[model samples]
Target chain A: MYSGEDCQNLLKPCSLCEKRPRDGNIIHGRTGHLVTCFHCARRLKKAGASCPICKKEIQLVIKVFIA
Target chain B: GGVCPNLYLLCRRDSDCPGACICRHDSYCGSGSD
Candidate 1:
């Protein structure tokens, strides 16, 4: 997890992948919310081609949220 | 007030990462830092 985020920062769901894409691989995407999990992968594989690094599916998540 | 990032090049130095990472291409340090 990132140490910089405080209460004010607010944790949000990644739209690109919908799941946390590891930790050190966030700069590649513009939004701070860009993760890639199993459910995301299944959906992404349906589309095609993902970021080689974090495996961030080039598609967008159907649903988005923040915490 | 709870971050202490300490990483420095050996010999003749007194600073860790100079306002950023002390890196150059692949050969670098201070990646996953707080």
Candidate 2:
């Protein structure tokens, strides 16, 4: 029997993007684990991306609450 | 307000005192901070 792990690493492009492009200005914030490539971070956002500091939606969520 | 108190002339220097301010003592000097 194939273990659950054996059924993985599948390849298929998702119809919806994981994330949206953050504003160019907000991109200046830096922490550390910015694995997302410069192109992905700027335009092709991935929802899988996480905040470096508070680990929240962080960008838009901050604007909705703080600003 | 009550003739601005003391007939608006609360200073007095009837004597010929020298080297001293004969008027009210509301003088000021500069202090350097900013």
Candidate 3:
């Protein structure tokens, strides 16, 4: 099984914000590139920003609760 | 209700938080470890 450390290593700065934690519940868009903060997600939806990685439109973004 | 484990916010419903968040037997919102 992947250890917690292994999981942590996979985490990177949000493709849009370059912020820490990248812990928001909205990992939208292809490849989950919309992995961003709730604040940024809100802003993206407001401004209609596309995913920096996949170029998917931020449409009707929603949150997903998970571990 | 407690803050979401993923996004910190008071639970409005089960959907208000992460899937790991449980509506406890006592009806309290609980989060799972990241």
Candidate 4:
């Protein structure tokens, strides 16, 4: 089970913009790295930005929901 | 819908996972750890 702080961290602002809520949980298709929110992800996709962590081409962006 | 364990995420296939993790029979991503 996640601790209170762990859950709180999930609600923190998106790392990229630091403005929007971290509602988007995405995974990079090529590197298999999980990072970013939906808003920033869309910007990255449209802007042709690579994965922030791995710096690999963003072939796919998978959004995940936790329940 | 139960919560996935630490560092694991809900997934339908292996490609949905990150790093070297794989989708287990439990439908969660992990490195085959219990």
Which residue pairs collide in model 2, if any?
A18-A46, A18-A47, A19-A46, A19-A47
Candidate ranking under DockQ, highest first, comes to: 4, 3, 1, 2
Error of 3 at A34 (Å): 4.7
Q: Give the alpha carbon lDDT tens digit for every residue of A11-54 in model 4.
A: 45678778754544444442354456667776876887776766
Per-residue alpha-carbon lDDT of model 3 for A19-45, expressed as tens digits?
A: 554443333322244266556767765
lDDT of candidate 1 over A1-67, digit per residue (tens): 3255563233344346445622222223232223344365345457674654566534432222121
Candidate 4: segments with Cα more than 4 A from true spot? A1-13, A17-30, B1-34
| Superior by DockQ: candidate 1 or candidate 2 | 1
Model 3 lDDT vs. the true structure? 0.47
- Model 3 scores a TM of 0.38
Interface RMSD measured for model 2? 27.1
Off by over 4 Å in 3: A1-10, A13-20, A25-31, A60-67, B1-34
How close is every model to the real structure, measured as TM-score? 0.24, 0.18, 0.38, 0.45
Model 4 steric clash pairs: none
The chain B TM-scores of all candidates, as shown, are 0.17, 0.17, 0.31, 0.48
Using lDDT, rank the candidates from best to worst.
Answer: 4, 3, 1, 2
Residue-by-residue lDDT tens digits, candidate 2, B1-34 = 1111121121224132223223221111111123
lDDT for each residue of candidate 4 in B1-34, tens digit (9 for 90 to 100): 2223443455657776656566743333654344
Q: Worst 10-residue stretch by lDDT in candidate 1 chain A?
A: A22-31
lDDT of 1: 0.35
Candidates 1 and 4 compared: the better one by lDDT is 4
